[model samples]
Target: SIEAKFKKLGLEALIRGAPIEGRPVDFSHGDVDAHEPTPGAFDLFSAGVQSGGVQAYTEYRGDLGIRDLLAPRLAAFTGAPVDARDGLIITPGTQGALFLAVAATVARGDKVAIVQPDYFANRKLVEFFEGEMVPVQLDYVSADETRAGLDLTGLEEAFKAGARVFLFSNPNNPAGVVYSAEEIGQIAALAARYGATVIADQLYSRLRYAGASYTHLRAEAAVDAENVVTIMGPSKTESLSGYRLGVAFGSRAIIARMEKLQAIVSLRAAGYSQAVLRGWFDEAPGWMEDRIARHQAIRDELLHVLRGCEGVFARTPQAGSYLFPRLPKLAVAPAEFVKILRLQAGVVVTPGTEFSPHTADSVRLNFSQDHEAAVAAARRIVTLVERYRA
Candidate 1:
């Protein structure tokens, strides 16, 4: 069981999600050329370097001072309190936090509730830990859909069927859809009733578009504060991906477990790099608004190109920088066509299968990039689709 699974996970032909944005236009990941890192990050990193081991090595959870600085800001942002001493851990990345969270909660034969077409890593990590996945689909393609399309009834069924752990993303990764306040409430109530734990990846929470109302799972009154672990970072919206910082807070016991695993896995987020987090939640005036506006423009242009094509459809993303568009029936398989797109059209996109087995007919683009290049690449994609239409 172990050997086969590991081998399957490591197959080379699999289009591993790596960024190759050096191409004329790449939409595989979200580090846009148009934005810069958070203000004041360099100064803090310099100070850390000057401080030597004082900042170089910290408690397994993280530097107490750094945690002290971040906890209150995170609490205020998420609409919940964070206990710096016992409820937070700094990780190598949000990816690292997710790995540890799954490691802490899932064991062999455990049942895990996972959202279909969410973050690709959620499925891989759960599989690595040998957990049984109970997948609930997201109906993002329905016309007149005004909210993120998680199927609540199916989710509750998974919880009732012995799933003790639920993992998902807010402003979900591949589709960039944010849950409605009502959906968030139902999720909390269901988890609470089923005595389940929720691991929420809120890395994109701060990147929400105008008019998007984000509801925090931890903030819901029905769920105990200790049952939710929120994983966030300064990576995506703030243009701080290179710092490799991730924060996991809530559930003292779970945080402790994550810290222990982190100790063995990576020995805490790079101590000096942890200093960059000081810039988080502290961007200069008008900075965030400007960033959101630029991304919204990109999203609009891409959607226009995609929607203009026959048989092509994508929901307007309410947050984050992704566009998951279902493709027309093509002459070639979806996987082969993605390779063709790269070599022929100078555009790179993630196959929708990365998010879910049911999504093989779709493709995901991270539209956070140079405005002109992104739009041009999207048009190229449409042209290729026309060429290969079945």
Candidate 2:
């Protein structure tokens, strides 16, 4: 079993539980768009209420009606049709989807190949399952962008050593780099070669930037479709975090295991929140594009601020809301700086270590916020780095 290699910064957990927002500019947190709830959710909730469908319990897997609507759309997205009855399940969020997925596949002492600097909970969930973590590195700082993708060499080694499950996020959480199609295919081929199961966290699959290309593992002909599970949701980009809805589909056997676990853990995703998913892929034309445009603007501004700072290095993220900056050596530790950014500069950021042990000199920012406010907070981050200059 592996211990958590990273820890969240000061008050990070608390802030999410109850945000201080005491400072005029608190870059310490992300998902600020979570402040704005989706109107579609309410409309769908109303419909469910009037129809008297929201009050009943769905099967352990989830609402059959919702799964019916999602399975075809998911099939189109993943290039494989899933049976709504047995191959798909809805959960509280992609986070819940992640938990159930891991628990379903891993047993005590199982070797799980996972990425460094992936979604924070990925590591934790592996530990929760009493699985051993075989860490594969991701170098997202390369000037040649694709060079910054996943380390397939290390991945194959892990699988060679008998990692039963391979799990990772696309448009990865902290660095926001998307894997190239080549990398995706190679991973699929390797997983197939060694008979490994792949759990693809493509939560940000729909939030791709203009120039980025992605490949879904489930879509790869060489990959064993029976051995893959694709995890996705409408929470982040759709401003639907409040609904806490997510979807996972693939191998019916694994989905069955997840359903069994979920049956006991959460029963089902909040019955009413299931209503909001109708807005998924069904939103009016231009709605998603407008949201993308808005975040892209903020991303550019924040990138400028970080890139302009001396001794601070960051790559232009191809997707997702995060920007991870590797800081120069400092008189204080990087973790300490994360705390100082909030305590001293009224700016808060997650410590780089929260992503991976190798990233202790880095920090993460979720720029999903008011454009101008985020820029100003970013500037403050630059100033604080200057104060603790190495």
Candidate 3:
């Protein structure tokens, strides 16, 4: 049964074969070849290393000192106060936070509300925990809805039906639509009414394009402070993923549970690596703005190229580096095409099936590659799609 779930996760596509030799432009994940990591990350890490055993070990939830330093900054960033000693836990990555959050709240046969076409891991982890999944769809492609078109009725229905846990990503992973304040408020009200726990993944919140207003679900007053766990990190926007640092704040009880799990799973993130988090929200003045601009430019170019094709359809993502482009009916199986795209086109992209079963004709690209190279790789993808257009 465990093996079956692993297969469904589609991790094989990323790891099955030998690595593509030479300079293959990978769109499968955000590697940030075009940009740089946060300035002075190494210097901070060096300082931590020089501190010796103090930086080498910490409480399972991580160092109270670091948590103390981070809590206020996180509170200001999310527009909500976090108790450094109780409501926060530093994790190996937002991935770890998600795993622990799911483990903390979801039990066998627990009804969990999951957004269709959200992060792939959300589905897999729920499955791993043996929770019953209630899928709510996100209508990201329609031209009429200015806001992210989540099925509010479906979500409310799921809540009413006793789905006690809800997990979703803001500035969503494959489809990068940021939730509006109204949507967040509605979700908060529904969760409060049903007494549900929500794990909101806001990893890409900082990478929003201009004019996009991001909402922090935990900031909503309707939901009890203990019902929400907001996961964030400097992994993507700051290109500090290599540090393997992530943070989750909110819900003292859940944070405690997550810390318990973290105690056994990897021993509180990498101790020395945690030091790099100090530079997270404190990047140099223009660094973040510039990163967003560069990503927006890449997003524009990729959308232009994909949209130019005859039957290809892709929405303009409001935030994040991901672009989910629906290809026309293809001559090859979507899984097969993923392989062809990698082998023949030298471009590796995640198939839409990884995000949702209904999206077999789509592929997701993390456009955080070298500008010129990403554009070129996109052209190669377009050429292949045309060649196999059905």
Candidate 4:
């Protein structure tokens, strides 16, 4: 029924193919098309392949060594003490991490607070677990108040109403609005007051742009309370998606439950791919810097093109490789215009409606393409918008 409701919202358009000539210029599937993992990732995975144990199951939580190796680093990364033996689990992906976090915490008819226009999976996963989904506004396009567009008042209201779990993304998905320090602190206090737990997706934590700062919500308050599971992975920034790995660290009780659920669900992220964690956060000097710089350049250019187009509007991304541009009024419907963009202009994008009904007039573009194609796609998008101008 949720899938049907999602389809009615026009998000199903995202699943369609764009049969265009040349490189296809797709903007779907996040950064999978743009980059590769650090060379050391492949090197370590290769070493694991030769060692033979990589293909064998170690423990439901993960191989002891992999968990041990990541424990301190992840602890420092999240500003908390992670008990490697109990406070962490190697998940199949950040998606899996989210799955376990929601599955472990939420139950039938429980109220779960989520962000409107967030990572699409947030709503779906909460619903999948039969939790009531409560959407809090992310006022990204509004300039009225600070707190960097996170509506703290709205969040507290959800908690006040007994939302037991709050799941959201930092350096948010689609719109790329990074939560400010004040916003995170407020969220921390609210969660603590209302006795709510949080599943914070920090998958894009390392992809911030110049002038944008990120506050790890767990660090600001949740770690001491052990009411958070901070999710991160090498997939987005490191482009190690093929490894299908993600890490969640926080409350020992929650981690223990996730390990139990994961033991039944996936049997501990891929046995061999777990080796790729060794290369994470260890990229050579300038490697990650270069990656961020390239993505930022593309984001800038895409923003420039969108803002220059008559009536088109977009907020500058604070981090991540996405641009959500509110399209000009079109002679055709928004979803139809998206189809036409793919059919005639050779550019494929996720309709902004996929994020939320409030964003129905926009489209989300993943600018993490090969630079040339990304730029070319931006221009084609502009051209298409003009052609369909209302």
Candidate 5:
């Protein structure tokens, strides 16, 4: 029984309601509207259905060809190797990919390390597996650079304390801070020393704002062979969240294990969804790049508007679609702050508590909505903060 296997380790809470701040722009929910399977995406989807469905549907339950063909394309885009196909497994979404990854690598009662101010879902997943969630806080030194990357000292302690898996988001959600290649290498080295598996969520890989680079853990020698699982998908890059398509890549053994877990959990990852993604990959190579540029512009404009306001403090994200802002002296709780923003300003945002174990003074702003609307929303937040302070 799971209880017996996880006796000493307390079961962390599983199942959280969908985030509230994300309810407005829903930017908090990853993915952009432009890449969704809108009428435009449907046109492409219909063509693929008519064109033999990307890959011929064979009777074999787990065929590698479909994933194999797409893996190289992903590698080329991320600068990884074509042979990385051996480590790839396509799943229903990044969430499922992560769940399968955790299941494959961690044992019940094992300690799992996660970067702080992360997507709540990661912590929830760890709990679901009856593993301990050990947070490695990300120190925010400046508004412009909220995420200081991973702290090596804290990581060492977690590893020493028996953490077996490390999960973090690159171009992180909420803060939107992307890690440098050197920083990622350091994490790789630490994981290698402790024999821990690294799970890098590169779902926002292609969504850099400026000079941020996407570094794959596989590039570092310290990362053990087949020990690093990297997940990406159309949910963010192609903005097809509802399509529910994502892929995970790592060592052959890891993929094999995850594949088994995936089959038991969901049978297959929706054949029709895979066909749609494959179709997009073949037909629209520029789709992701165009969407990335659009989000970058929106973020920049949102930052500009916030900069002009007084009282509230926020920085433009280096990558990702959301912004983290902190408002001091506001008496409202984070949830209440979000509610007021929605009612008073006709704006929606995710309260700070939704992202991490933070207080009500902070909030997560999603820039995935109309650029003008997002800017106006930021302006309203500033106004609210000013009024509250007075």
Candidate 6:
């Protein structure tokens, strides 16, 4: 069914290709090694496993306790009420949380709206649910320039056209732009008017580089609870992606629906991972802050290097761990250019097509690597760009 849909949508060509080879610094995936969970923190994971016994069965209700504790802390961090915890559900990862939310809300043949230059998974997830994917493109000054903001008119059109749900990433994946609170509020208000639900993937909320606080959709309209769901996780914040822990918080009725679906699909997340996450909440609220600072420093350093480079048009991201750069004169598509860069330059990066709805010419670069590695990768990229000029 997915194959038929891909063919019908003319995305078969894009799907058939393999990922690029040999990247000196992986800028494709939004992973940062700078904040690996501390040894003491991981001890909790070990302790849980030992206590549960090797390969032993675990209960779903017992696994939910970590989420119960972490949800309140997350609500406090986001300024939502403690009662919002009733809307929370622990998921294997942000991806799992997204899957559950989408599955619960979208019906077959319903329309879903998503912003362009967004996470690639959104499109696939929508299609999996047999929902029609309508993309609202972001405004960009040029091919290489960062997105200015959402196209409000385009968004309104999608909503008016009967899109039942809107999904978008904050500190948007690949593009690395953070939307202001005012902007988020505007979108939420518009969605409310259309009776469309909004799913805010604030997975990178704590990874801000410009010292800006993320504006959660719940903050946009306290009473508009039915129309908004926000997802968050420790993968990006705590560098505990291996832990596969994440949560979604929203209205009680909506969460109730999600719980029902999750029971059939994923059943429940890992118990040990949640236990470790609960320990982190009790002991390490500052852990994410420290990690954010490290990413900010790397962003600054990479920006400095990019400023001196030629043929590469890039802007420093305000938040998140990526830089989307345009390589127009490389005589190849972004996918091919990334291949040459990896094979010739030994630097790995995700092609722009991965995020672009229209298959634009750009590539994503992750600066989540150490300062020295990021700097070195920048230099190599600059040199490669120069060599390809002639």
Estimated TM-score for each candidate? 0.95, 0.91, 0.94, 0.92, 0.85, 0.87
- Model 5, 227-343: lDDT tens per residue? 787887767655678768788886778888887787778876766556666554554556666767878888887777766656566655776787887776755545665676666
Tens-digit lDDT track of model 4 for 77-129: 76767778878889999888998999889999999998988988888777777
Q: Which ranges in model 1 have alpha carbons more than 4 Å from their true place?
A: 11-23
Deviation (Å) of 147 in candidate 5 = 6.7
- lDDT over C-alpha atoms for residue 113 of model 1: 94
Q: Candidate 4: how large is its RMSD?
A: 3.8
Candidate 6 ranges with C-alpha deviation above 4 Å? 1-3, 6-23, 30-34, 53-62, 82-85, 140-148, 283-286
lDDT score of residue 315 within candidate 4:
76
Candidate 6, residue 132: Cα displacement in angstroms equals: 1.4
Supply candidate 4's per-residue lDDT for 88: 83
Question: How much does each candidate deviate from the true structure in C-alpha RMSD?
Answer: 3.8, 4.7, 3.7, 3.8, 6.0, 4.8
lDDT of 2 at 132: 93
* Candidate 4: residue pairs that collide: none
Cα lDDT, all candidates: 0.87, 0.80, 0.88, 0.81, 0.70, 0.72
User: What is the lDDT, from 0 to 100, of the residue 331 in candidate 6?
Assistant: 42
Writing each residue's lDDT as its tens digit, candidate 3 over 1-390 gives: 778867855534433234333357889888755677888999999999999999999899988889988988898889999899999999999999999999999999999999979998999898889899999999887874367889999999998888999999998889888898899999999999999999999998889898778889999989898999999898888888888989999999999999988988887889999999877778889988998998999999988998889888887888888888988887678898898888877899998988888988889999888888888888888887877777
Candidate 6 lDDT trough over 10 residues, lowest sum: 11-20
List of clashing residue pairs for candidate 6: 23-347, 23-348, 24-346, 24-347, 27-366, 92-244
Write the residue-wise lDDT of candidate 6 on 1-390 in tens digits: 767877633323322234323336766654545456644657877777787743123443225456566766876777776343467777778888898889888899999998888887888888878999888987643543233478878888998999979999887887677776667778877887888888989887777765555677777763287667888877765667788878788867777777777777767677667666756456555666677788888887877777676666665576677788766475455566666677666688877777764646677887677677668877777766665553
lDDT for each residue of candidate 1 in 250-342, tens digit (9 for 90 to 100): 999999999998999988899999988877787788988888898888998889999999899998888889899999898788999898789
Q: Give the C-alpha miss distance for residue 48 in model 3, angstroms.
A: 0.6
The collision pairs in model 1 are: none
List the candidates ranked by TM-score, beginning with the highest. Answer: 1, 3, 4, 2, 6, 5
Clashes of 1: 0
Q: After superposition, how far is residue 390 of candidate 6 from its true place, in Å?
A: 7.3
| Model 4: per-residue Cα lDDT at residue 378 | 80
